[PDB]
Design an enzyme around this catalytic site. Structure first.
Site, PDB file in Angstrom:
ATOM      1  N   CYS A   1      -7.254 -27.561   5.001  1.00 27.46           N
ATOM      2  CA  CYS A   1      -5.959 -27.050   5.412  1.00 27.46           C
ATOM      3  C   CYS A   1      -5.220 -28.096   6.244  1.00 27.46           C
ATOM      4  O   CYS A   1      -5.793 -29.093   6.696  1.00 27.46           O
ATOM      5  CB  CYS A   1      -6.113 -25.738   6.190  1.00 27.46           C
ATOM      6  SG  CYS A   1      -6.469 -25.912   7.925  1.00 27.46           S
TER       7      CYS A   1
ATOM      8  N   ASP B   1       0.844  -1.178   0.000  1.00 25.88           N
ATOM      9  CA  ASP B   1       0.000   0.000   0.000  1.00 25.88           C
ATOM     10  C   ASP B   1       0.891   1.243   0.000  1.00 25.88           C
ATOM     11  O   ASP B   1       2.123   1.156   0.065  1.00 25.88           O
ATOM     12  CB  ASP B   1      -0.971  -0.031   1.188  1.00 25.88           C
ATOM     13  CG  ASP B   1      -0.266  -0.195   2.534  1.00 25.88           C
ATOM     14  OD1 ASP B   1       0.895   0.206   2.667  1.00 25.88           O
ATOM     15  OD2 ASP B   1      -0.888  -0.712   3.480  1.00 25.88           O
TER      16      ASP B   1
ATOM     17  N   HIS C   1      -5.133 -21.974   9.791  1.00 31.26           N
ATOM     18  CA  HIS C   1      -6.436 -22.400   9.281  1.00 31.26           C
ATOM     19  C   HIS C   1      -7.210 -21.221   8.694  1.00 31.26           C
ATOM     20  O   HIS C   1      -7.805 -21.333   7.614  1.00 31.26           O
ATOM     21  CB  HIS C   1      -7.290 -23.095  10.357  1.00 31.26           C
ATOM     22  CG  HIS C   1      -8.759 -23.047  10.052  1.00 31.26           C
ATOM     23  ND1 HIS C   1      -9.393 -23.968   9.240  1.00 31.26           N
ATOM     24  CD2 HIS C   1      -9.706 -22.144  10.407  1.00 31.26           C
ATOM     25  CE1 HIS C   1     -10.670 -23.649   9.131  1.00 31.26           C
ATOM     26  NE2 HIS C   1     -10.882 -22.537   9.820  1.00 31.26           N
TER      27      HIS C   1
ATOM     28  N   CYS D   1      -6.693 -28.729   9.758  1.00 29.88           N
ATOM     29  CA  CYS D   1      -7.920 -29.524   9.862  1.00 29.88           C
ATOM     30  C   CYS D   1      -7.702 -30.992   9.497  1.00 29.88           C
ATOM     31  O   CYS D   1      -8.517 -31.838   9.880  1.00 29.88           O
ATOM     32  CB  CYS D   1      -9.028 -28.897   8.987  1.00 29.88           C
ATOM     33  SG  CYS D   1      -9.591 -27.288   9.743  1.00 29.88           S
TER      34      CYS D   1
ATOM     35  N   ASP E   1      -7.729  -7.785   0.414  1.00 25.51           N
ATOM     36  CA  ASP E   1      -6.785  -8.002   1.506  1.00 25.51           C
ATOM     37  C   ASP E   1      -7.506  -7.705   2.811  1.00 25.51           C
ATOM     38  O   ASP E   1      -8.454  -6.923   2.829  1.00 25.51           O
ATOM     39  CB  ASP E   1      -5.549  -7.104   1.405  1.00 25.51           C
ATOM     40  CG  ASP E   1      -5.862  -5.661   1.752  1.00 25.51           C
ATOM     41  OD1 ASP E   1      -6.281  -4.916   0.856  1.00 25.51           O
ATOM     42  OD2 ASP E   1      -5.732  -5.288   2.934  1.00 25.51           O
TER      43      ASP E   1
ATOM     44  N   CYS F   1     -12.869 -28.183   5.598  1.00 21.29           N
ATOM     45  CA  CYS F   1     -11.650 -27.454   5.278  1.00 21.29           C
ATOM     46  C   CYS F   1     -10.543 -28.457   5.007  1.00 21.29           C
ATOM     47  O   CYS F   1     -10.377 -29.425   5.751  1.00 21.29           O
ATOM     48  CB  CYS F   1     -11.257 -26.539   6.448  1.00 21.29           C
ATOM     49  SG  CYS F   1      -9.740 -25.587   6.162  1.00 21.29           S
TER      50      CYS F   1
HETATM   51 ZN   LIG Z   1      -8.694 -25.723   8.286  1.00 21.16          ZN
END
Ligand SMILES: [Zn+2]
Ligand SMILES: [Zn+2]
Lengths: 377, 377
Positions: free
Chosen positions: A311, A94, A340, A314, A271, A309
């Site tokens: 990720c 930015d 996560h 998880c 963002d 999820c």
């Molecule tokens: Zn997750």
């Protein structure tokens, strides 16, 4: 094969929503894109390889904070933000202008601003020219034009004058960027549309930016207190004003339902500190809405934070064990929640991209809202 | 009120088992006692306040390792082991003699031994005089006489000569200790009985030690490969040979059932690396025997490591979450297992003390073995 400086390709559309890619010299950015906010690569933060493995294609650097500590020249001597953040893919910076409004301010004029560091009181200067130069020293791949934020809510007069100053400063940002060969040939420059909630001011701004010409166009002046209804109303007429064949960037947004609705209105890039701030505060985003992992209900819950999820957290960790870590104040707890949350955001963007590609995004958006707000977590 | 140098009081007896207290200037040691093996107070090890909160009244320092790194003189300049280990309660140090047999050895004679450091090859010397002096430099509260270990199994001739040398070295340890006023007035000295499995040699040793006179008496030469049956048989006749009104110390023992049976045979003090070594290796002691926390059966087991343990780990952490930490290689996993294991050992000692006091220790020992070996975990 050689990689271009900046090439935006739209692969598929549904209504105002678009999906595609931005090709840059340091990598490809899949759109619509979510950019996590980056920080120095230290033991305090997620490792850069972890952030990349969540799916992030690009991260954001806050010019204002980097210029107060350790300073732009210091960052340059260390090899720029790519070395400093351990991140060799694209980085967007930015301008620093928003934080001088929201966090510091000794002098303001058409020239630029002078402000006091909230850290050590030292004086600093920003201007279209200085901001673009600092972002060059940071090694930024996507440079934001320096504009003037007027606090929310703004009078019709304050919104008019800040937008007009911002457009004069947009030309100055353009010329400063173009004057530096190493920057102009290797990075990209985005302009920022202003005009608050006033349609004629937004059109004026858009026309000015298109006449100057930028690689991308941000919608500024939103997510500053206005609420989602009015933010969507402003996006409804503001985004169609921008050039269609360049990326559209909604800065500082936001909650998952904010993102979905903004994509419905033509936004390509986002963002937000929300995933990280929530992760440190024990709040996890899920498809059934956010959850507070400290709640007693999770103490014996063997399911992951989100059962859909994928990720790395998880795959492995239960709500019960993240609950235990967080309640004990163990830093691992905050690290897992943050990983996560950022990965969930990337999976949201991937589902957005895939659904647009298949022409089922409007149905995905309806399905998403019904489940996110029912909160059957 | 002023505290004595060393006062052993027996509060209650059942058969050969005794329970009571050793009062020293740095605190009271409840007996029968288990001494965890201490290390430097760093981020690598449990904090000293954590070790104390498990119930430990005294910890052990390995003279051999401390003299190789960082060295006894260096420890002294830092204020002794009490500062070095962050532990202001009593510390027992071994003589260093066992590790020179088991871990290093350039010269051996009646004078002493010279050995090569397995770290940097440097040469070091131990003797009754040097060992007692080093333990003084370490700030030791309970000093072990320096003896000669003969490896297991020992011939009747090797056992005879090592025991006799050890008794000559026991007198030398006594005289060295007594020659140093600051040490003799503030610390205590234990002698070590030897003689392997031979009753007449054990009696010879005991008679020699009693004639010299010590504050406590250790049974050496056991837990070196002989197995529990023969260790118990040797304790059966060896412990009654020692002075009744001084503490009896079985060095390097051991497993919980070893401890219980040794107390049945009159032992008052114990040390072992087992709780720490097991904790780092993912093995937890429980009243139903040891468990391997990596086993798949524990991945969803919401019960604590032991459902009757009242350590701080078992108040809070489930088997499932310690399992997850250990499987991920998280240091917290090893820290929690080690804290529980040391606390479990202290709770074993407390149950031993309480049962002797109530005259139900022989029943406790039978109850304990039946459940520990059934392994219904
Ligand atoms: Zn997750
Ligand atoms: Zn426990």
């Amino acid at each position: 094969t050689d990689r271009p400086r900046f090439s935006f390709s739209i692969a598929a559309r549904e209504g105002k929503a678009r999906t595609g890619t931005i090709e840059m010299k340091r990598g490809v950015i899949r759109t619509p894109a979510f950019m996590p906010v980056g920080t120095a690569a230290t033991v305090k933060a997620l490792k850069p390889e972890t952030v990349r493995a969540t799916g992030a294609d690009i991260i954001l650097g806050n010019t204002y904070h980097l210029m107060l500590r350790p300073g732009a020249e210091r960052i340059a001597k260390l090899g720029g933000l790519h070395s400093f953040m351990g991140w060799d893919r694209p980085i967007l910076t930015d301008s620093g202008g928003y934080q001088v409004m929201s966090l510091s301010l000794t002098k303001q004029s058409e020239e630029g601003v002078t402000f006091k560091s909230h850290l050590d009181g030292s004086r600093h200067m920003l201007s279209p020219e200085r901001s673009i130069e600092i972002q060059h020293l940071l090694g930024s791949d996507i440079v934001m034009a320096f504009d003037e934020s007027t606090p929310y809510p703004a009078t019709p007069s304050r919104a008019a004058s800040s937008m007009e100053r911002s457009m004069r400063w947009a030309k100055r940002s353009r010329d400063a960027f173009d004057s530096r060969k190493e920057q102009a040939e290797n990075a990209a420059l985005f302009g920022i549309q202003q005009g608050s909630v006033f349609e004629n001011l937004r059109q004026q701004s858009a026309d000015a930016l298109a006449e100057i010409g930028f690689d991308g166009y941000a919608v500024g002046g939103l997510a500053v207190g206005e609420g989602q209804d009015e933010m969507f109303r402003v996006l409804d007429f503001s985004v169609p004003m921008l050039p269609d064949d360049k990326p559209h960037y909604l800065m500082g947004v936001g909650k998952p339902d904010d993102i979905v609705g903004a994509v419905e209105r033509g936004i390509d890039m986002f963002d937000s500190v929300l995933p990280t701030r929530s992760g440190r505060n024990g709040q996890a985003f899920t498809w059934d809405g956010p959850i507070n992992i400290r709640n007693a209900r999770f103490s014996e819950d063997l399911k992951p934070l989100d059962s859909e999820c994928h990720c790395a957290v998880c795959q492995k960790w239960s709500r019960a064990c993240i609950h235990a870590l967080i309640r004990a104040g163990e830093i691992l707890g905050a690290m897992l929640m943050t990983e996560h949350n950022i990965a969930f955001y990337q999976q949201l963007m991937q589902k957005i991209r895939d659904s647009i590609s298949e022409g089922r995004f409007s149905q995905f958006a309806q399905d998403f809202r019904a489940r996110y707000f029912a909160r059957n977590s």
